[PDB]
């Protein structure tokens, strides 16, 4: 069944476990947006979306029009929100495929409106508020409020939602986070007061869902925690029990007498050469990767008395002491990036009840 | 029509230039193997293969059965050599798709042979030498050569240090190969294709041509190191990683930017947000990330996010949303620069370009083709 030497194993059971533990945090009326941008953080957006439609979630979020359309082309019917920039070249496609667009200027809204009029159907949009991230969004001021009342009047636009995003909600002190929330509440209250109707207000990411049970509003945005990982070591982990879903695996391709094992995974699979202390798990024991990581393979020193043969399974992360977090720490980056590094040629294989149920090649 | 906010622009003209300058190094009868593993080092294996069939090259090389089969599924007819490991689970598919397999041992050759027998057609194989270069290996090879449903077509080794200043070790490896080559010549064994040279060797070692050379990094317009003889071979990089300015704003003094608010403004600043992030392969690890906009270099500020970055515009330029941003492949922003910042190599920076980044191909300064790996 598996014909590639190196694959990403995704445990669908663990995803369900994570989602259900997330849902147990939430009250009945609070909506869940499943964040599945960057191919569901490396796990496979189409498949993870299929699971989310089954488990019933209220919205899907992506980072790009094309990620949105890929989901549509694969049968997905859930509302999809592009969280970021939509270039003008992609408005038509967004509207035709019912992808909800993030909007953060009146100019953008007006051009979208012309296209939606042109096509003779409404564009659904969510307004972004820059509450403290300084990334995307309207500033939280009197000027933005009027610009929003204005864009709300554009026939051929359904101003459905409004959101902001926290820059430091995974840190110990939530001061800045609540400072951001207040900037949002400013816009929320002024628009409430201006008779502008916004069905979906949302602000909470994974960190906020966990640590800030007062920031639920109409909906929350669950990303990293869906996949079985914490946004940091500083969040209240005891609130939510998680199982990581991804195991990055290869096979022992060669053995040689030190005993050196050659494994057919390299930096072009996302096992980055930058790692200063690369390690692997084999038959429950951790071993050093030795010499430079190559494009398509690495050499590992077996310095323990284990019976090991060509074909035996190697785990790069997702089990025992070899974790995406460990690699991230070695890199000086974050688990998010390690997950997203898994490259195109790495087949995603999905497990369920300990059976392989599906294998996706991104080449064939 | 480009509809993605972030793309990898591949200049086909430059690829042709590189290949032709490579061909000018080579004598009439020496074959070229175009190394296009890892999706042609991020440039697009299918398209680069199409170009190579057009420009005529002898052979294609890949790192994985599936890379080989992807090329076949897209009409490619050139010989393809899997340079790396073929698991037993993939022998059948290799043979059925005429993917030439690298072999290291008699035992592997014999199993392949059974499958080829089973399928009633020959497997094409190339022998790899570290097969120790001793008398034992030479008989083992004369043995495998006999096996009926295998075509022992070629034999090769690969240099570990040919891009360094001193090749001593390289010529040490070459000798070990020449031992095997001469003993098999002397036995009855044919070997139509003997090859050893990678990009570094093609450049610095004009005596290691044999029947064929393996051109990789150089094809794409990059040098395997700073130590090779660059003056022998003029290269034009083929790839430009680009995005668009997605948002632009004037930010007050002392305001934090991005996760952890690790950059705070030091006066009023113009901040451009660009829709490229670490999940497009613009790694967050970079300590000094930069971008080129309207010919000027700018600092990326605050943490690089999954899907976007913040850029301080501190020069009097006229920039509007939609304007073009270059992450590398032009002027001072190069894959090599990023590699050096990271403590890795240009090879890795090229290969980091992720699936969602559309490859768009240019030719005479016109867009001729756009490939989405999502749609
Ligand atoms: C607008 C927005 N909402 C929700 C999320 C989900 O966050 P969690 O995954 O922490 O729940 C992200 C993630 N943005 C990624 C996370 O890291 N860097 C980024 O840009 C985001 O940009
Ligand atoms: C067997 C073999 N031959 C030829 C090449 C071509 O190398 P150049 O790109 O230098 O021409 C490679 C690339 N191997 C890559 C280069 O860096 N690390 C690797 O594992 C290879 O593995």
Author numbering:
A (entry chain B): 3 to 259, 278 to 384
B (entry chain A): 3 to 132, 140 to 384
Paper text:
Alanine racemase (Alr) is a pyridoxal-5′-phosphate (PLP)-dependent enzyme that catalyzes the reversible racemization of l- and d-alanine. Since d-alanine is an essential component of the bacterial cell-wall peptidoglycan, and there are no known Alr homologs in humans, this enzyme is being tested as an antibiotic target. Three crystal structures of C. difficile Alr (CdAlr), corresponding to the complex with PLP, the complex with cycloserine and a K271T mutant form of the enzyme with bound PLP, are presented. The structures are prototypical Alr homodimers with two active sites in which the cofactor PLP and cycloserine are localized.
The second structure is that of the co-crystal with the inhibitor cycloserine (CdAlrcycloserine). Cycloserine is an antibiotic that inhibits Alr. Two structures (CdAlrK271T and CdAlrPLP) contain the cofactor PLP, while one (CdAlrcycloserine) contains the covalent adduct of the inhibitor cycloserine and the PLP cofactor. In the CdAlrcycloserine structure, cycloserine forms a covalent adduct with PLP, d-pyridoxyl-N,O-cycloserylamide-5-monophosphate (DCS). The formation of the covalent adduct prevents the covalent interaction with Lys39 that was observed in the CdAlrPLP structure. An additional hydrogen bond is formed between Tyr268 and DCS that is not present in the CdAlrPLP and CdAlrK271T structures. Several hydrogen bonds are retained in the CdAlrcycloserine and CdAlrK271T (CdAlrPLP) structures, notably those between Tyr43, Ile226, Gly225 and Tyr356. Structures of Alr with inhibitors, such as alanine phosphonate and d-cycloserine, show that these inhibitors covalently bind to the PLP cofactor.
